Chain A
Amino acid sequence: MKGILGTKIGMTQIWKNDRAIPVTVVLAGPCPIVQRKTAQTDGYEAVQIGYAPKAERKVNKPMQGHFAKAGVAPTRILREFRGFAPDGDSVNVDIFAEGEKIDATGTSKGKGTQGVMKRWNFAGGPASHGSKKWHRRPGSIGQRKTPGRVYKGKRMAGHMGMERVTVQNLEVVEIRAGENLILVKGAIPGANGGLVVLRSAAKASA
């Protein structure tokens, strides 16, 4: 339910009661409530919300009308959060607390076309004892006549990364409320400068 958007600033070192704890720093900047969607009108419950500011020369006339309907200086990015039904606008401060677990979703740093050794952890071949495919290469791909084909869902070289990724149950080390910063234990997916969505834990872990 609870969520907000932000940028991935970086990862540093920090002590808490004398134990080093790596943290990713996220700017969870103020998020305007643009469109507000009820089941009664739009068939499901959610709220639209925006992030990076964008100068209005750069804005489509239709997008200007969309932001103008609510009264919001136009933002570069928009997202929806199901079940989240706030009031006013969405600051980092009010909706997170020190020590909530929270899911952290982002877009994996993307690594291009990768071989099966990187993309899927294949063994690859011996590098000696005479053998071209001296590594890197997938081996066999089928059985023979009476399977007849190669399997759907098979694993082979492809575009690795650049994917949506959630990370469950990251811990909230510190909230510096006024600056719109938030420290979070461990490693959020993505790259510095990238979009990230911080949200409640999806699992109610007991």
Chain B
Amino acid sequence: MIMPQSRLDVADNSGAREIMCIRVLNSGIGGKGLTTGGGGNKRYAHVGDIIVASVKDAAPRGAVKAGDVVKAVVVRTSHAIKRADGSTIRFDRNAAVIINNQGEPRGTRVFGPVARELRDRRFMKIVSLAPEVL
């Protein structure tokens, strides 16, 4: 449950370190890079959901500067996330990893763990930079 205005933390070494949401999309990877669409009224981002976001606060030196409109994917909800077995996960803090219109990450590494759902949701290479799934 991310919605616009909600700041997130950034899980990558691309220069940004603090993005504010600005839009919640409903698209994903689909053989031509990112799909468009899903409708235009979905109101909460879950892990594995793409969002758009302004880059409020960024590290000097580094590939993404403040004010940049950006398409991150969220990797860490404080909101709980449930599995088909019945397992639940929750992380203490909300965080996302900025990407580009192929879905590839923009930094050279991910920081902290990432939800296993990104593997379902086909972000095959953000999972690769990730120290742990779960």
Interface residues of chain A, those whose CB is within 8 Å of chain B, are 13, 15, 18-20
B interface, over-half SS: loop
Contact mask B60-99 → A, CB, 8 Å, 1/0?
Answer: 0000000000000000000000001110000000000000
Q: Which residues of B contact A (CB under 8 A)?
A: 84-86
Alpha-carbon distance A19/B82, docked complex (angstroms): 11
A18 contacts across to B, CB distance below 8 A: 84-85
Determine the chain B residues whose CB is within 8 A of the CB of A19 once the complex forms.
Answer: 84-85
Q: Measured between C-beta atoms, what is the minimum distance from A110 to chain B in Å?
A: 31
CA distance A108 to B71 in the complex (A): 45
Contacting residues, chain A, for B86 (C-beta < 8 A) = 13, 15, 20
Known: A15-B85, A18-B85, A20-B84. 7 other contacts (CB 8 A): A13-B86, A15-B86, A18-B84, A19-B84, A19-B85, A20-B85, A20-B86
Closest to B82 in A: A20
A19 to B85, CA, bound (A): 4
Instruction: Report the bound CA distance from A20 to B83 in whole Å.
Output: 9
A18–B86 CA distance with the chains assembled, in angstroms: 9
Give chain B residues whose Cβ lies under 8 Å from the Cβ of A13. Answer: 86
Minimum CB–CB distance from B70 to chain A (whole Å) comes to 33
Closest Cβ of chain A to B116, distance in Å, is 15
Give chain B nearest CB distance to A185 CB in angstroms.
13
With A and B bound together, what is the CA distance between A13 and B84 in angstroms?
12
Within the complex, what minimum Cβ distance (angstroms) separates B82 from chain A? Answer: 9
| Residues of the B chain whose Cβ atoms lie less than 8 Å from the Cβ of A20 | 84-86
Chain A nearest CB, measured from B75 CB (Å): 24
A19 to B84, CA, bound (A): 5
Cα A166 to Cα B51 in complex, Å, equals 38
Top 7 nearest A-B pairs by Cβ distance? A20-B86, A19-B84, A20-B85, A18-B85, A19-B85, A20-B84, A13-B86
Nearest chain B residue, comparing its CB with the CB of A21: B84
- What's the Cα separation between A15 and B83 when bound, in Å? 13
Chain B: CB-nearest residue to A19: B84
* Interface pairs (10), CB distance under 8 Å: A13-B86, A15-B85, A15-B86, A18-B84, A18-B85, A19-B84, A19-B85, A20-B84, A20-B85, A20-B86
